């Protein structure tokens, strides 16, 4: 939530820092800075996937028990 405002404000600050100083070197560090920010969002977002991956595992264990009971009861009925 904090990173989003910063990249956006920088985008807006990079828009007018060109006019405030065209020949200044800091514009390419801002792009790089922008690139660094891009490296960060993807890096931070990827944090969720391992936890997400773990959740997928539980249903497989869970669904079979939901399936095995049905087979046993059906067999008993037959």
């Amino acid at each position: 939530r904090k990173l989003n405002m910063s990249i956006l404000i920088n985008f807006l600050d990079l828009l007018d820092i060109l006019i405030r100083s065209p020949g200044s070197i800091k514009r390419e560090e801002k792009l790089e800075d922008l690139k660094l920010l891009f490296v960060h969002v993807h890096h931070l977002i990827n944090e969720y996937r391992p936890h997400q991956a773990r959740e997928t595992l539980r249903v497989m264990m869970e669904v079979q028990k939901r399936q095995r009971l049905e087979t046993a009861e059906r067999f008993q009925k037959h």
Binding site: L18, P22, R27, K35, F38, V39, H42
Partner: protein, 49 residues
């Protein structure tokens, strides 16, 4: 020809001003596109990785 040269000799200021102004814009023009290119390059390659 010599007379034309020596008449233009004092009229070498405004042409130089126009030339340097055009170069400034041209020099600047390479810079805006380069920045745009960098942004374009990053989306295409950095995002994918």
């Amino acid at each position: 020809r010599l007379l034309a040269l020596v008449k233009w000799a004092n009229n070498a200021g405004k042409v130089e001003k126009c030339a340097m102004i055009s170069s400034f814009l041209d020099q600047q023009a390479i810079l805006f596109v380069d920045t745009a290119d960098r942004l374009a390059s990053l989306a295409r390659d950095a995002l994918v990785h």
